[PDB]
Design a protein around this ligand. Structure first.
Ligand SMILES: CC/C(=C1\c2ccccc2OCc2cccc(OC)c21)c1cccc(NS(C)(=O)=O)c1
Ligand SMILES: CC/C(=C1\c2ccccc2OCc2cccc(OC)c21)c1cccc(NS(C)(=O)=O)c1
Ligand SMILES: CC/C(=C1\c2ccccc2OCc2cccc(OC)c21)c1cccc(NS(C)(=O)=O)c1
Ligand SMILES: CC/C(=C1\c2ccccc2OCc2cccc(OC)c21)c1cccc(NS(C)(=O)=O)c1
Lengths: 10, 244, 244, 10
């Protein structure tokens, strides 16, 4: 979720 | 007259409980090391898969939440299929090529859970070998595996997702151009739902086992935490090329 | 007439290079496991230390950047001193109590680097035992260890930091109330700079060794990455109770 | 740094 999200948002 | 050490009372209050290492000597070191190393490589692979997916044409076009959803549902599909491919490309019987420096021999697997997972993987590898899957067919099939599962109520960008998935199915048919081959490769894609379901089960078992306490990297741990309920909620809808 | 598989060319372009596991069979499993487990517990301890520090009176009052700085410089001081304390409290000769389920015997340490680190820790433990340090003195000394190093050019909240540090020194003197004891305990605090410098050196060595490839949890890895240059920049100023 | 920062900012 959170770690995945900030990787996706990069 | 007498100054009291008032802050030491507060230092006592805030002192946290002792941490436990999770160390159990009953689990052999070899076992703990290969599982831990596999989880660590696994975590790094999910990162690679997220950066790969951000580069797939059409993928960035879906809503951020759908991209999130597709990656959380498919990470094990991407990893297992790429493992089958690298093992097939090595050509050695019973060898699983997790990485160029970590080639596991299923015939050296003493841990039964790991032995069972490896045998399923050997079926994936055996199937790519039987069908002599080309690199081009493989790339198409891998992209389809990113689009194989959806939530029960669907995605926010359902129409666009269906358009993109349709495009990759057509892409697979072109790379091959006999229709027969298509039926067989899409049948192999369909069979991956069963493979992954066994891999996720072993993964979920280990992730929750506080006695073994095998280490998991942070991002693999968050994705497993978010998924476990869904794998019991009946919230995952598997997309099948063929019945049933 | 002939449809080309155009997307497969882009799928080829974006396919990432194969990941390496980092696995080296020359390193024994026992070795890899204890180092990995220690780093994992270590990472969890830094988290605990950050939550502890946020609860220390005065600490939250400093600028967020100073709180950041103090934690990055002191994490190894906090960890080594708490390890010395738990080992002293166990009373067994040559035992290092990393956790209640991970009590290492230095006399079973086959890896020389780990053997050397453990011997220094046994000196910390031996000193707390010789001086019969009480829990109250220990809590004060632990807080002082959070305030033992500063950046070369100082902190953003220097005046307030000096006021807070002064308060904890006074707190230590009260908990004891003979001045002699104070000199000896503040001398033990001073000697921790040397202990930690050896521990950080072994830690930095392992962190950079890509052949051993011992695993480190994410937050320990970021703090080590930020600190390594500073441990060579000459950017750390050690605060001494006594000369020299 | 970043992981430490978001832990401190909590
Ligand atoms: C029209 C859908 C079809 C097949 C099919 C289905 C999906 C994708 C590709 C296909 O290619 C042909 C193909 C090839 C093998 C098997 C197939 O379905 C079993 C299909 C089919 C269905 C029933 C009978 C036949 N003909 S035959 C003479 O092979 O029995 C073909
Ligand atoms: C997520 C990484 C993972 C595997 C893995 C690891 C690295 C590269 C490719 C992989 O393919 C899947 C694959 C297939 C078979 C075995 C695997 O590792 C055991 C892997 C896996 C699968 C199931 C469970 C676990 N973790 S555990 C051992 O703690 O229960 C890991
Ligand atoms: C005034 C600072 C001092 C000591 C001192 C220094 C810092 C903190 C606490 C102290 O407690 C007394 C204390 C106790 C032992 C050693 C000390 O410095 C060596 C100090 C001192 C310095 C020189 C001589 C003496 N007197 S004696 C008779 O012990 O030689 C004391
Ligand atoms: C940061 C955790 C750590 C130690 C540690 C770990 C858990 C609990 C208390 C600790 O006290 C410090 C302490 C003291 C002696 C030995 C330690 O672990 C080896 C630890 C440490 C210190 C130096 C190096 C390394 N990592 S390595 C082995 O890869 O080079 C870890």
């Amino acid at each position: 979720s959170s770690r995945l999200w900030e990787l996706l948002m990069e | 007259p007498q100054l009291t050490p008032t802050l030491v009372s507060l230092l006592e209050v805030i002192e946290p409980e002792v941490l436990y290492a999770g160390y159990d000597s009953s689990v052999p070191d070899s076992t703990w090391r290969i599982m831990t190393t596999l989880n660590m490589l696994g975590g790094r692979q999910v990162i690679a898969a997220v950066k790969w997916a951000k580069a797939i044409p059409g993928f960035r076009n879906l809503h951020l939440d759908d991209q999130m959803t597709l990656l959380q549902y498919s990470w094990m599909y991407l990893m297992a299929f790429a493992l089958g491919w690298r093992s097939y490309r090595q050509s050695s019987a019973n060898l699983l090529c997790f990485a160029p420096d970590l080639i596991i021999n299923e015939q050296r697997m003493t841990l039964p859970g790991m032995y069972d997972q490896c045998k399923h993987m050997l079926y994936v590898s055996s199937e790519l070998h039987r069908l002599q899957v080309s690199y081009e067919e493989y790339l198409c099939m891998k992209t389809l595996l990113l689009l194989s599962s959806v939530p029960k109520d669907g995605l926010k960008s359902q129409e666009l997702f269906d358009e993109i998935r349709m495009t990759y199915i057509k892409e697979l048919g072109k790379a091959i151009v006999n229709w027969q081959r298509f039926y067989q490769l899409t049948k192999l894609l369909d069979s991956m739902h069963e493979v992954v379901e066994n891999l996720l089960n072993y993964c979920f078992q280990t992730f929750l086992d506080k006695t073994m306490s095998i280490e998991f990297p942070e991002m693999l741990a968050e994705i497993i935490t978010n998924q476990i309920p869904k794998y019991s909620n009946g919230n995952i809808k598997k997309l099948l090329f063929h019945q049933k």
